[PDB]
Amino acid sequence: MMVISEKVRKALNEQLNREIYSSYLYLSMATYFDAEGFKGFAHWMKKQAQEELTHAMKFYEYIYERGGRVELEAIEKPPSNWNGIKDAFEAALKHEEFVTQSIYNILELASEEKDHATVSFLKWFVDEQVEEEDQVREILDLLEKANGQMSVIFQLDRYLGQRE
Amino acid sequence: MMVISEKVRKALNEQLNREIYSSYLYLSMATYFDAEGFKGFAHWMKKQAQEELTHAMKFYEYIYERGGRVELEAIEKPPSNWNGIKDAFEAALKHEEFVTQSIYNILELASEEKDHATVSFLKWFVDEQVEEEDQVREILDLLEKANGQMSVIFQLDRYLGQRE
Amino acid sequence: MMVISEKVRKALNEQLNREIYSSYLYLSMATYFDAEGFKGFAHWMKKQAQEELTHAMKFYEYIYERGGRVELEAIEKPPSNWNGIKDAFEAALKHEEFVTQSIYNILELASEEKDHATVSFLKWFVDEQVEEEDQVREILDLLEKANGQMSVIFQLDRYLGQRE
Amino acid sequence: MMVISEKVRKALNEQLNREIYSSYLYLSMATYFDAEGFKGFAHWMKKQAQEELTHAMKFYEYIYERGGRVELEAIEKPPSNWNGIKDAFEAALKHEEFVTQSIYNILELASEEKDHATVSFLKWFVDEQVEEEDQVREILDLLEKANGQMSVIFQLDRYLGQRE
Amino acid sequence: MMVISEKVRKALNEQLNREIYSSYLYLSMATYFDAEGFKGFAHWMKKQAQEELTHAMKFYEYIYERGGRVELEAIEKPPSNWNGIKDAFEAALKHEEFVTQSIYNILELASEEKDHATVSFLKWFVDEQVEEEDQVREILDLLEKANGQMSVIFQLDRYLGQRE
Amino acid sequence: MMVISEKVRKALNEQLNREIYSSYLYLSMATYFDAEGFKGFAHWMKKQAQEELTHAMKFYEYIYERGGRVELEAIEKPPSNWNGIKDAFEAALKHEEFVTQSIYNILELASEEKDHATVSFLKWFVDEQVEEEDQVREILDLLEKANGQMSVIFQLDRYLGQRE
Amino acid sequence: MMVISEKVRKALNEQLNREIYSSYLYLSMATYFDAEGFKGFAHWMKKQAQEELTHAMKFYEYIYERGGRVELEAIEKPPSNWNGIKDAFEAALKHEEFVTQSIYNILELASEEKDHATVSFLKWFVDEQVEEEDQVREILDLLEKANGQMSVIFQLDRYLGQRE
Amino acid sequence: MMVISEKVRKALNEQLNREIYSSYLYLSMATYFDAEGFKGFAHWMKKQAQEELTHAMKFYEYIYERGGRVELEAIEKPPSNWNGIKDAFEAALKHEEFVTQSIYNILELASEEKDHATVSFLKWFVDEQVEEEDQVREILDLLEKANGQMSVIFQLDRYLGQRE
Ligand SMILES: CCCCCCCCCCCCCCCCCCCC
Ligand SMILES: CCCCCCCCCCCCCCCCCCCC
Ligand SMILES: CCCCCCCCCCCCCCCCCCCC
Ligand SMILES: CCCCCCCCCCCCCCCCCCCC
Structure with a gap:
């Protein structure tokens, strides 16, 4: 049986889907950079997309x-056009700060329900x-x-x- | 400028999105298998999901x-539940056969337009x-x-x- | 079930049988060269015989x-005697050319049926x-x-x- | 010239062809096992078939x-169908016993003709x-x-x- | 004896000569880059010239x-001058596309004559x-x-x- | 600017082109040997063609x-046919001596103009x-x-x- | 079922028991040498008893x-006393000769019944x-x-x- | 001379004979298992038979x-048949427990005679x-x-x- 409340499970599941959209977003940014002829930026974004999928699976397993x-x-x-190089990276930062706040919301929910396990588990993502x-x-x-x-x-x- | 016709680009881009869905569908099959207590079938579906992404990325680079x-x-x-294992894998098979036929559709299209480069590139997927x-x-x-x-x-x- | 037509499967299976006879034929050639005291030529025919078997098995697995x-x-x-070294190899060449045409017939058949998987598969043999x-x-x-x-x-x- | 009687040469030559049929029979059994989804048993049989060919070649060289x-x-x-796994293996055993008796018939013939060279050579097959x-x-x-x-x-x- | 038609032999032979000119053109571009003091661009073109030779020799051997x-x-x-670095590369691209179409023309010819061996051989150049x-x-x-x-x-x- | 006279430049550039023709003539000799079934002689000629290109590149860099x-x-x-093996190698020897005299001509020209650096550079080719x-x-x-x-x-x- | 006649099995089974007795006999010789103060002779005899068991187990597995x-x-x-070292070894030799004849008898019986597998197997003991x-x-x-x-x-x- | 009493020597000598029979009995159990198709259990008994012999030899040397x-x-x-697996092992245990008691009897006998060396020696066996x-x-x-x-x-x- 579930040892987490249905509320926390929902929060985690939605964060899982949120991470999947993040990864898809960065892939979209990669399609933009490649379109603009910047293989290095595209490459960075493809790696960032991959890192996001691992985050999603990390939520997957815990659930x-x-x-x-x-x-x-x-x-x-996801959007596919940006005004320029900087705007795309700006949107990437704004998106990261958004996922960080999404993480924060689950942490506060888990903390209010005294779900110490989930609160500990979220520390890594913070x-x-x-x-x-x-x-x-x-x-x-x-x-x-x-x-x-x-x-x-x-x-x-x-x-x-060069990002590994 | 593009050296592939708009019709072929579109056929390739839609196949690319189709692969991404295939990957998502297999991840969903995995959620189904993991919920039913079958880790093994889950692990297989996850690996099958990553394989489908590498396929999508090949379409990506070629485009x-x-x-x-x-x-x-x-x-x-994607569906998140199936009437038992057999029903699941049968849907999986049914889905692959569908992507195979999709692949076949692009190949005949390229062939018809005498786009030999795309016809040759599709061979690997066939x-x-x-x-x-x-x-x-x-x-x-x-x-x-x-x-x-x-x-x-x-x-x-x-x-x-045990799938690697 | 079979995802290849009865017609195509028959063409493959009959080719498989043809490759086995080819193997037996080259072996027979080896019996002739060995009887004439030419160990090297015999060795070549034995190697060629094994090769054809690997071809047979390739069709076997695809089927x-x-x-x-x-x-x-x-x-x-198969015949067991030839009018000299030259006659033997001439017969071998004639057979190889017959095998290629056979391979060709299956390819055109599969192509007519739009069985791209099989057409692609045959490239290696061509x-x-x-x-x-x-x-x-x-x-x-x-x-x-x-x-x-x-x-x-x-x-x-x-x-x-010296053939390996 | 031949230093073996024509009788023994015929018996050796017939055994060679008999080993080839064995090899072919075992391949047929592989076709059945593969048709029945048992890759492993089919593998064992494909290996058995190859081993039989080396035995035929050992008769070849002696001649x-x-x-x-x-x-x-x-x-x-050869037959291509059996009533289950056990039935196929039983037929394999029965076939082996038959080849064992075949080898005995030659051994006895050679021994009768005092062909000690051929008798000794057959010792290995026994x-x-x-x-x-x-x-x-x-x-x-x-x-x-x-x-x-x-x-x-x-x-x-x-x-x-796993048979090597 | 020739197993390729005279039409196909002629097309291949003409393509071999075309690949040779291609090599020579790229060398000529090197003469231009070096005359403008760009060792790197010249190097790249010298390497391209060699690559083209290897292609010509693959046609040589297949014939x-x-x-x-x-x-x-x-x-x-070939021309020995261009209006700046970029212009030289526009010319290179336009030339590469011409070679591709040339390869396409042979492929279609072979295909129409049902010369499967030649169509297959050309896939590598496509x-x-x-x-x-x-x-x-x-x-x-x-x-x-x-x-x-x-x-x-x-x-x-x-x-x-740096091109190797 | 040029520190070599236009006359010497011309002589060096024309020699570079002469070396390329030599290279091409030896390849042609190779097409003749391959057509006659002497792969070894063809190989030797192909290696000779390559050596001639390195010489051309020597002139190239010095210019x-x-x-x-x-x-x-x-x-x-270039001619593509000879009346036999001997005839071809003879035509090769005659061409080599032609190349030597050509080198002699540039050398005497540079020496008359007291272009010691060019005279010296030519020693290696002599x-x-x-x-x-x-x-x-x-x-x-x-x-x-x-x-x-x-x-x-x-x-x-x-x-x-076996030439390397 | 048995592929050896009851008469051969009987002969083999009895030889096994016979080999076991030889082992026991040599152990007994060991008890005599040890009592006479000859540890070395005793040692050799204990090793001999071990060898005999390994022989018995060879009949065992073949049966x-x-x-x-x-x-x-x-x-x-078995006897437990001898009239001296020499006497003990003469008895051992005599016993060995006895087993040799016993092997001979089985060999002859096997040969008479045309049981080639058993004849061959007995060669090792001869x-x-x-x-x-x-x-x-x-x-x-x-x-x-x-x-x-x-x-x-x-x-x-x-x-x-020092016997190992 | 014997420093052990005739009473203790006989108990030790009888135990040695008892250990040899134990060995033979376990070998017999192995003949039963093999006869019934159980190679594993037969293997076990074979190892057990060998173990008992080392016990015998230890008694041997101490004497x-x-x-x-x-x-x-x-x-x-020894008995050559049992009414099923369980019946055999139960007999084995009964025999084990029997040799155990036998050991105890020697131990109590030696102790009663104040033969401390023998009492100590038996410890290993208990x-x-x-x-x-x-x-x-x-x-x-x-x-x-x-x-x-x-x-x-x-x-x-x-x-x-798998016993070693
Ligand atoms: C370098 C290119 C990376 C592209 C990533 C694109 C991601 C798109 C989002 C769709 C979700 C795909 C599901 C994949 C699950 C993989 C699970 C692996 C578990 C070990
Ligand atoms: C050392 C020389 C080897 C000669 C080999 C000759 C083979 C002749 C083929 C005769 C056809 C008999 C069928 C053989 C089937 C073998 C299947 C192998 C499957 C792995
Ligand atoms: C390092 C710069 C490379 C320059 C290549 C120039 C090519 C000019 C074309 C003229 C034809 C030359 C013949 C080359 C024959 C090569 C044969 C190789 C056989 C393996
Ligand atoms: C270390 C000295 C060896 C002494 C051997 C004495 C043998 C006496 C014969 C009695 C029979 C006992 C049964 C032995 C069975 C052994 C089975 C081995 C299976 C691998």
């Missing part, structure tokens, strides 16, 4: 580990978000300093294209 | 390689489908030997759960 | 992979047939040059006796 | 080594036959113990499917 | 494999062209955004100058 | 090194020509002794066929 | 391989007996040269005591 | 070490008997859990056949 069941929901069509947001903020600061110069952008694209 | 662009579409909600379909027919035939015996179905669960 | 079944047919008695025919024409060219001089013929026998 | 010649004969169509019969009897015994339990039969299949 | 003969034709003087056109297109798009900036042009030179 | 530019010229159609001529004379001597005896020709062909 | 059954019979009390008798004769000859001299017997004892 | 002599007695015919009885009881316990399930009985057979 079953507590007797819960995962229900895959419809995934919405720390991971602080890391992802910082990555994007760095890229943005760099793009901001680049101020449109194709020379710096090309470097940035080459570097980000 | 760009031909000067086109990828556009990600909305992914409909061969994969032959392999994927055969693995499901195998499983279905093995389940058939179980003839309801659960102790046997559990043995097939432990085997499929 | 089952497409839900078909293989039925082994009676193998006719390329192998090109390689096999060429090996025999080279041998026949060298024999033509040898013009019956035991001196060079011994060399040919030695070289061919 | 030439005694100055004889080999003449390949037609190969009759010993091998004892081992080949034991193997099949061992398998039959495992099948009898399985007593229709698809569970253990699944294990047997996978086991025999 | 002999089908019993045909190669006849080398005169090679026309796939290689897709890859060659893509490299050039990628380079052109990068130069397009470079808009003549000497900074990025130097980055491109070095990068391309 | 740029002295501030000149290379201009690829049309390459004429010594290489000594080696090239000798290799063909050596082959011609063996063919002379062979006097048609296919027995030694085969050996000569396999030997030359 | 079941041919569908037979082993029935252990009573073991008679050769083994020749070697065993030889070891005992070798010891007897060393005891002869010894000529009652304790000095030499001490060495012989310590020596035979 | 000499105390200046006594060993006299091998006639060994009786401990080994505990180990052996426990093994047989565990086997019987598992046979009970098998509850006539031939399927399970074969599983145990395979387990005991």
Whole structure:
């Protein structure tokens, strides 16, 4: 039987679907970067998409580990066009900060219900978000300093294209 | 500029989205199997899901390689329950046969427009489908030997759960 | 069930049987070369016999992979004597060319039925047939040059006796 | 010239062709096992078929080594269907026993003609036959113990499917 | 004897000479890049020239494999100048597309004559062209955004100058 | 700017083109040997063609090194047939000596203009020509002794066929 | 079922019991040497008893391989005293010769019944007996040269005591 | 001279003969299991038979070490059949417990005579008997859990056949 409340299971399941949309969003950003001829940015986004899927499966397993069941929901069509390089990364940061707040909402719900296990389990994602947001903020600061110069952008694209 | 016709690009892009759904459908089959207590069939479906993504990404890279662009579409909600294992795998088989025929449709279209590059590129998928379909027919035939015996179905669960 | 037509399965199965006779024929050629004291040429024919068997088995597995079944047919008695080294290889070439045309007939059949999986599958045999025919024409060219001089013929026998 | 009587040469040549039929019969049994979804048993049979061919070639070489010649004969169509796994293996055993007696008939003929060379050469086959019969009897015994339990039969299949 | 039709032999032989000119053109572009002091771009073109030679020799060998003969034709003087780096690459792309169409024309001819062996052999060149056109297109798009900036042009030179 | 006179530049560029024709002529000789079934002699000729290209590239680099530019010229159609092995190698020797005299001409021209750097650069080609001529004379001597005896020709062909 | 006649099985089973007695007999010789203070001789005899058991177990396994059954019979009390070292070894030799003849009798019976498998199987014991008798004769000859001299017997004892 | 009493020597010498019979009895149990198709249980008994012999030999050596002599007695015919598996092992246990008591009798006898060396020497055997009885009881316990399930009985057979 489930050892988590139906409320927490729902919250986790929806976060699972939320992570899947995140991954699909970043893939969409990759289709945009590839369209604009920036293989390095595209590459970074494909990796970011992959990392997001692992996050989703990490929620997947926990849900079953507590007797819960995962229900895959419809995934919405993501945007495919951005004004430019910086805008796409800006949207990536805004999206990360959104998933971080989504994580926060589950943590507060689990905390209110004294579901200490789930609260402990979420700690990892909190720390991971602080890391992802910082990555994007760095890229943005760099793009901001680049101020449109194709020379710096090309470097940035080459570097980000190195992400393992 | 695109060197593939708009008709072929569209056929390729829709197949790309179709692969993503196939992956999602298999993940959903996995949620069904995990909920029913069959980890083995679950593990297999997950692996089958990742394989379908690598397929989608091949369509992805080729579309760009031909000067086109990828556009990600909305992914409909997949079924989350089946009337038993056999019913599940049969839906899986039925689905693969459907993607195979989809693949066949692009190939005839490309062939008709004398787009030899796309016709040749599709060859790899035709061969994969032959392999994927055969693995499901195998499983279905093995389940058939179980003839309801659960102790046997559990043995097939432990085997499929060995997939690398 | 069978995802290949009865017509196609028959064409495959009959080709499989044809490949087995081919193997037996090359073995027979080996019995002739060994009786004439040419161990090297015999060795070559034995290697060629095994090759053809691997071809047979390739058709064998594909047939089952497409839900078909293989039925082994009676193998006719192959010739056991030839009018000299040249005559033997000439017969071998003639047979190889017959096998290729056979391969061709199955391909056009599958193509007419839009059985792309099978058309694709046959490509490998088409390329192998090109390689096999060429090996025999080279041998026949060298024999033509040898013009019956035991001196060079011994060399040919030695070289061919090196085939792995 | 031949240093074996024409009688012994004929008996050796007929045994060679008899080994080839054995090899073919075992392949036919493989067609049946594969048709029945038992890859493993089919594998064991494909290996058995190959082993039989090495035995035929061992008769082949001896014949030439005694100055004889080999003449390949037609190969009759073998049976392609059995009433279950146990029935196929029983027919295999029965076939083995038949080849064992075949080897005895030659041994006795050679011994009658005082062909000590050929008698000694046959010694190897007598010993091998004892081992080949034991193997099949061992398998039959495992099948009898399985007593229709698809569970253990699944294990047997996978086991025999490992034959090197 | 020739097993390919005279029409196909002629098409192949003409394509071999076409690949040779292609090699020579790319070398000519190297003469231009070196005259403009771009070692990296020149290097890339020298490597491309070699790649084309290997293609010509694959046609050479296939012609002999089908019993045909190669006849080398005169090679026309290629252009030795272009209006800047980008212009040279536009010319390269347009030339790569011409080669692809040339390959297409042979494929269709062979296909119409039912020369399956030749249609199959050409598949490799269809796939290689897709890859060659893509490299050039990628380079052109990068130069397009470079808009003549000497900074990025130097980055491109070095990068391309690494081609192995 | 150019530090070599236009006259010397012309002579070096024309020699570069001459080397390319040599390369092409040796390939042509290869098409003749392959057509006659002497793969070894064909191989040797293909290796000789490659060696001639490296020489062309030597001239190429020196021209740029002295501030000149290379201009690829049309390459004429070479003969494609000879009256036999001996005849072909003889035509090869005669061509090599033609190349040597050509090298002599540039050398005398550079020496008259006191272009010591070019005179010095040409020394390497004068010594290489000594080696090239000798290799063909050596082959011609063996063919002379062979006097048609296919027995030694085969050996000569396999030997030359081993050139690296 | 049994593939050996009841008469052969009987002969084999009885030989097994016979081998077991030999073992017991040699152990008894060990009890005599030990009592006489010759640990080395005792050691050799204990190893000999072990060898005899391994021989008995060879008959054991062969009997079941041919569908037979082993029935252990009573073991008679062996002598426990001898008139000296030499006497003990003469008795062992005489016993060995007895088993050799016993093997001979079974061999002859098997041969008469045309049971080639059993004849072949007994070959190993024929050769083994020749070697065993030889070891005992070798010891007897060393005891002869010894000529009652304790000095030499001490060495012989310590020596035979090294048998592994 | 004998430093052990004739009473203790006889009890030790009789125990040695008892251990040999125990060995033979367990071999007989193995003849029964093999006859019934259980190789595992037969394997087990074979190992048990060998273990008992080492016990015998330990008694053997100790007897000499105390200046006594060993006299091998006639060994009786052991039972060759049992009313099923359980019946055999139960007899085995009964026999184990019997040799245990026999050991106790010698121990109490030696103790009564103040033969401390013999009392100490027997300790090892008391401990080994505990180990052996426990093994047989565990086997019987598992046979009970098998509850006539031939399927399970074969599983145990395979387990005991792994004894080292
Ligand atoms: C590098 C390209 C990565 C593209 C990722 C695209 C993701 C699209 C979202 C759809 C969900 C797919 C389901 C996949 C589940 C995989 C589970 C693996 C478990 C080990
Ligand atoms: C060392 C030389 C080897 C010669 C091999 C000759 C084979 C001739 C084929 C005769 C046809 C008999 C059927 C054989 C079926 C073998 C199936 C193998 C399946 C793995
Ligand atoms: C390093 C720069 C490469 C320059 C290639 C220039 C090619 C010019 C075309 C002229 C024809 C030359 C003949 C080449 C024959 C090669 C044969 C290889 C056989 C394995
Ligand atoms: C270490 C010294 C060896 C002494 C051997 C004495 C043998 C006496 C014969 C009595 C028979 C006992 C039964 C032995 C069965 C052995 C089975 C082995 C199976 C691998």
